[PDB]
């Protein structure tokens, strides 16, 4: 058939599938929510929100701000180029590694588009306990990266 011509390349459609769902989700909450406004789904556990991440977690590394936009965007470019080459070498039949590589590739490009087009990354998933603990907001692209990376760790056993 014609599937042997491309040779494990069509797995990129999983990566493309993640990018569109990540960008269509960020567009919704950015239009229905004010900044830091909450939509309570569970009165103590789960709520939608809207926050812009400028990389303040690593603000201890420099005497200024704004560099996180360019350094973190540069890292995703290098990692993305290595993944596609790694995916091409993957032999036919290694379904576990193929799906896993395509997951981290999509979530990396989604947040990359944010840092290059916008000045920040859009986060809308606020998980928390009542008031004693608040988990940092994330998005779908972070979910595809975390799930794909877990598959890599549990690969050879």
């Amino acid at each position: 058939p014609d599937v042997d011509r491309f040779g494990r390349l069509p797995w990129l459609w999983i990566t493309v599938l993640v990018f569109v769902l990540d960008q269509v989700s960020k567009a919704f909450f950015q239009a229905e929510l004010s900044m830091y406004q909450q939509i309570v789904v569970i009165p103590d556990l789960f709520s939608w929100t809207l926050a812009y991440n400028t990389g303040a977690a690593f603000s201890f590394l420099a005497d200024s701000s704004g560099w996180q936009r360019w350094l973190f965007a540069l890292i995703a470019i290098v990692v993305s180029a290595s993944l596609v080459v790694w995916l091409k070498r993957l032999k036919k039949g290694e379904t576990w590694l193929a799906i896993a590589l395509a997951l981290v590739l999509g979530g990396a490009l989604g947040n990359l588009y944010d840092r290059m087009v916008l000045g920040h990354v859009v986060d809308f998933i606020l998980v928390h306990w009542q008031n004693r603990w608040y988990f940092p907001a994330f998005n779908l692209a972070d979910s595809a990266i975390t799930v794909g990376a877990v598959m890599l760790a549990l690969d050879m056993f």
Partner: peptide, 4 residues
């Protein structure tokens, strides 16, 4: 790669 992630948001933070």
């Amino acid at each position: 790669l992630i948001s933070t």
